[PDB]
Amino acid sequence: VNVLGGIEYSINNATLCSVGFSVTRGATKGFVTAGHCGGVGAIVRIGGTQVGSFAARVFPGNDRAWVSVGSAHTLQGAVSNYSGGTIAIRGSAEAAIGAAVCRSGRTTGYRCGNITAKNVTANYAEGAVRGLTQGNACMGRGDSGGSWFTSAGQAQGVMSGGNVQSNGNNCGIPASQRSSLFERVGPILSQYGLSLVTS
Numbered sequence: 001v002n003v004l005g006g007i008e009y010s011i012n013n014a015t016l017c018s019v020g021f022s023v024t025r026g027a028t029k030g031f032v033t034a035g036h037c038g039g040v041g042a043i044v045r046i047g048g049t050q051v052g053s054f055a056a057r058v059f060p061g062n063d064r065a066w067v068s069v070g071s072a073h074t075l076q077g078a079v080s081n082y083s084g085g086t087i088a089i090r091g092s093a094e095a096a097i098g099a100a101v102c103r104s105g106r107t108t109g110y111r112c113g114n115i116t117a118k119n120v121t122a123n124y125a126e127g128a129v130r131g132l133t134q135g136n137a138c139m140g141r142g143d144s145g146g147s148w149f150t151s152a153g154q155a156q157g158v159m160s161g162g163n164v165q166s167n168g169n170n171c172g173i174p175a176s177q178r179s180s181l182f183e184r185v186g187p188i189l190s191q192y193g194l195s196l197v198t199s
């Protein structure tokens with residue numbers, strides 16, 4: 001199967017999240033995502049087929065993980081735009097507050113907005129997660145773990161949480177009322193010694 005930022009994956013055949021970014025660790029294939037999407041060892045399926053499992057995770061405190069992908073599968077250094085195309089990923093340079101940013105995930109597809117704050121703490125039900133970056137692109141339950149990136153292709157981070165409304169998303173309110181929080185990708189790559197697949 002092809003691994004691509006933003007696409008749906010299932011965890012333990014029970015819940016859903018979205019791929020963050022294809023990565024490698026030496027010859028080992030994988031992708032980064034949110035830690036709250038799966039406990040260690042959780043079985044991951046994409047496109048109706050087992051592709052690997054949660055290799056490591058931190059959540060709460062942080063909210064990060066990577067899923068090691070079996071060698072039979074192909075990694076794509078890109079993110080889906082949910083209309084038949086991809087956006088090439090070219091690096092992980094972090095963007096400043098006010099910069100434009102988009103995200104991609106299985107519930108709301110491809111959505112754009114701006115970076116609006118950094119080093120935010122989310123008081124999730126499972127506990128605090130610190131150091132999150134906030135944007136005002138909208139998102140919904142199921143987009144978690146999915147890619148955040150600038151249009152020029154710099155990976156920002158993986159979808160963590162935010163102020164979803166009773167319909168399960170914050171797309172029904174204007175961007176100015178939105179709080180959509182992602183875990184910065186830089187520390188995930190560093191902690192686990194992973195390399196972005198680029199194109």
Ligand SMILES: *S(=O)(=O)c1ccc(CCN)cc1
Binds near residue numbers: 139140145159
């Ligand atoms: S994730 O983006 O799919 C996501 C976002 C927000 C929530 C609300 C509970 N913190 C759940 C999952």
